[PDB]
């Protein structure tokens, strides 16, 4: 049973819709509210150095075994989590609000959590934009021979645009998984290693930690400074695990959508 | 064909005397709440019509029966089949209060669904129609209350749907804008599509409609054109307003006869 | 004494063509935005009155001049001295849409300020006045749109302030509730306090008011009782509505003569 | 200049007002929204064990030098921070919203951030209520001879009802300290020792860490299991520092209020 074709055709017919009113909430919240704007690089750069000051001062030595990894290891990974902590939560509560102001129109409601994620995608293109200015002070200048990450960038889109259907459609019917993912986004700072080296453990519990697909993309952005220009084949046994958990979430997310699509109006 | 297939429509959102669901429940999903209907066994035909008024007392909600026909609430029991109908009227709704007048036109015209070349052809008429000239490049939170309604009518009129449903304004506007507004609504009457109008202004619904329902607590008490129903509707109110035989002695009984009208 | 000391009142919230403040600014707190007045040099007296209507065109906002007198906006230049005035009318505002009818009475009656023994004496009349009987123990998000306004008028009437200010409803209600509503507003006319009423319904403001302002873009064009002003106000509209000499050829000039009326 | 008398008299005249509509937001948010209620002990008890699992597994031994302190040391302190992270932020944004629905009434606006704090005070009396059920499994049964903390409980009221005037009145005029305290509440997990033992440091930087008054109250609730029945005189040199920083915040909070009280309507 392929009902997910009906969801994916709606995003094809509305690709101008998903872009044009994407940046309106970016204009609504980041601007037209206060004084001098773009705290969203000022706020995490303060917020990064707090986590270094407590965790670099337990790992003063004992850094990852390359010559470079330091803070360099850390903030190359911490780009991803800023697009998780305030992009999974507000995607979930995007359908609690505003359905009164959406159901009185005629356009498919499946697109309604998908643009607010892409509204937070431009957080990267100011934050991940200013990491090159840091990374032009490395021993390499830019490593132009390998910064090839559009594919690993596209994973964060594909994972979150799929996962915010199980947590958006099923959010409105119960209003309790909002409390769940408010803690489940918390446990995904430590269940995945944004901070330490997971090589403190044998090959069972270490290998059974990357069942979380989010750790795969962190290996992508940390390989924005390595040189592994064929980073599929060294871990090809579970890079197909990544592209099967996204298609499992997307099919199951479509199935839970269409079995409730015309009912969440008394919620 | 015949423009509605409305048959035996019932709708119930039920009463919860205490806090929300699983207030006392177990693994069995059944709850213990008091039943309350809102619509009961509604069946009528519109035979391509021109226009149908809806009147009564707003204890019967009256917007429930509207947006059922707009296809945005699911009925509990009964089937309705129309056409490519309208989202009813998006007056004063969907306007974000942080964006300018150029922006919120691109909101709502995209929310209703129009291509990128259609919103530029439809652009300069709307600014010409609203007459808010300098304030078009200023966000809505600076506007007065009569200018949001001035603007919100201007976008959500160029729809060309099949079946319109109007709330209880029909000319929200201002003086010397309602004259533009009523002439705009004469186009839909001229074009001959169906319009479901709801009001409490008896003088306007006499001046605008041809057929008319009359709803009482979910029960359709009578449905003809205009000529006998509204005076009998006025016969009910003049009966009700005068004394209606001592509103404690009989109208408390009347509601209890009508709370008995929640069932056999 | 004389019930207002309104003198030379001006108010300006200024134009920002781009995003919000410090859009281009430095350590010097001055900004670069375009000036815009909304009120200019208003001075009148109310001499204990009975009632003053306010009419015009809602391009002049008209609620600015109201809630100045309610003492909730600061004027830029000018002094106003009244009394222990009213918060104007809390219709359809302050009602949380998560609490029942017993609850939201305890909200708004406490928000207006009444002791714990006063809210129990004032309690059963309000339920008797609203007539929503079974729904009083159910939160407001279940109500229809005509029942919130049914409820919100019932609390925010028993105020006993000194100087009332009314928005543009005066009987929001329903048919066969407006008859209760207009008789309730006759008490304030009987008691003899001051009431500042705003409308666009010419027929109601003739039927209710004794004195009347007329405001145009912040400029008080004339102020008498009723008898000459409103027909001259109707003389302005019938001049304006008919052709007003080719609305592109002169009314575009007229607004530019009135944009010249933003200054000398 | 004593303008703060005018603020404090308003709270005396409205003590029934501050209690009766306190629990309405408690009724509004915790109830009448979803299914089975009181996540606000279910959510932090999951949220406590995450911070133990990463920090107790660096302090597996090496615990505080009493015979008991363990997790026992930790969750006795973590009661305080739950009344900070979601009680300083929502107190600050309490005047961004709802002024349109408040200024159209007649009651003093100084009370308007003070009840929403007390609406979060009943979070204690379900969470701190269920810590005794844990603490009836200690070697002591309850230590009835010293659980005397109403005074140390009253500090958290007095600090937060005072601090949420500098961050509520001055919030609306700029709309930028909301972004500041969104990070300043973050830095007050590590600037104060909710987690480790601060005796890894000589008497200069260790003593200049308790300038934060919040660390004093954490010494109160951790002394809910010690037996120091005269815990003033051993640290009387800076328990008067606590009662002078609250009176400095309350006077300066009143001064910034009344110089702007009739102006925040165009914000």
Author numbering:
A (entry chain C), D (entry chain D): 1 to 267
B (entry chain B), C (entry chain A): 2 to 265
Sentences from the paper on this structure:
The wall teichoic acid (WTA) is a major cell wall component of Gram-positive bacteria, such as methicillin-resistant Staphylococcus aureus (MRSA), a common cause of fatal clinical infections in humans. Thus, the indispensable ABC transporter TarGH, which flips WTA from cytoplasm to extracellular space, becomes a promising target of anti-MRSA drugs. In S. aureus, ABC transporter TarGH is indispensable for the transmembrane flipping of WTA precursor, an N-acetylglucosamine (GlcNAc)-modified ribitol-phosphate (RboP) polymer covalently linked to the UND-PP moiety, out of the cell membrane.
Using the cryo-electron microscopy (cryo-EM) technique, we solved the structure of A. herbarius TarGH at an overall resolution of 3.9 Å, with the catalytic residue Glu169 mutated to Gln. In the absence of ATP, TarGH adopts an inward-open conformation. The distance between the hydroxyl groups of Ser64 on Walker A from one NBD and Ser146 on the signature motif from the other is about 6 Å, suggesting a resting state of TarGH ready for ATP binding. Similar to other type II ABC exporters, the TMDs of TarGH consist of 6 + 6 transmembrane helices (TMs) without domain swapping. Using the program Caver 3.0.1 (25), with the probe radius set to 1.1 Å, we simulated two back-to-back L-shaped substrate tunnels, each of which has a horizontal entrance along the membrane-cytosol interface and a vertical path through the cell membrane. The turn is surrounded by a line of positively charged residues, Lys93, Arg98, Arg100, Lys120, Arg175, and Arg186, whereas the transmembrane path is mainly composed of hydrophobic residues, such as Tyr51, Phe55, Trp81, Phe82, Val84, Leu89, Leu189, Tyr190, and Trp196. Scanning along the vertical path, we found a constrained bottleneck at the tunnel exit toward the extracellular space, which is guarded by Tyr51, Phe55, and Tyr190 from each TMD. Remarkably, four of these residues, Phe55, Trp73, Phe82, and Tyr190, on each TMD form a hydrophobic pocket, which is occupied by the loop between TM5 and EH1 that harbors another Targocil-resistant residue, Leu195. The ATP-free TarGH adopts a resting state, with the substrate tunnel closed at the exit and open at the entrance (state 1), as shown in our cryo-EM structure. At this state, the latch loop blocks the exit and functions as an autoinhibitor that mimics the exogenous inhibitor Targocil, while the entrance formed by the GL and LoopTM4-TM5 is open and ready for substrate recognition and binding.
